Amino acid sequence: PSGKNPVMILNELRPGLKYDFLSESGESHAKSFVMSVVVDGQFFEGSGRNKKLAKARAAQSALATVFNLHL
Description:
This protein has one domain (about 1-70): Double Stranded RNA Binding Domain (2-Layer Sandwich). It starts with 5 loop residues before the first helix and ends with a helix. It contains two helices and three strands. The protein has helices at about 5-15, 50-70, and strands at about 20-25, 35-40, 45-50. It is globular and about 40 Å long. The protein is α+β, with helices and mostly antiparallel strands and about 70 residues long. It comes from Rattus norvegicus. This is Double-stranded RNA-specific editase 1. Catalyzes the hydrolytic deamination of adenosine to inosine in double-stranded RNA (dsRNA) referred to as A-to-I RNA editing. Homodimer. Homodimerization is essential for its catalytic activity. Can form heterodimers with isoform 5 of ADAR/ADAR1.
């Protein structure tokens, strides 16, 4: 990431996407919350200690792919 938190970029850019909110990538002790995105006919999952990081992971994956598509 650069300029902002990556969630915020993917948010601003939002090319045509939708978010799913999932719990459960664990561990059962300090936790992972899971964010799924569907974008350009493409699908990603990102596991983070909360949405500020789950979305960051999901965003980062999507960002890399779709920006390689130039989309």
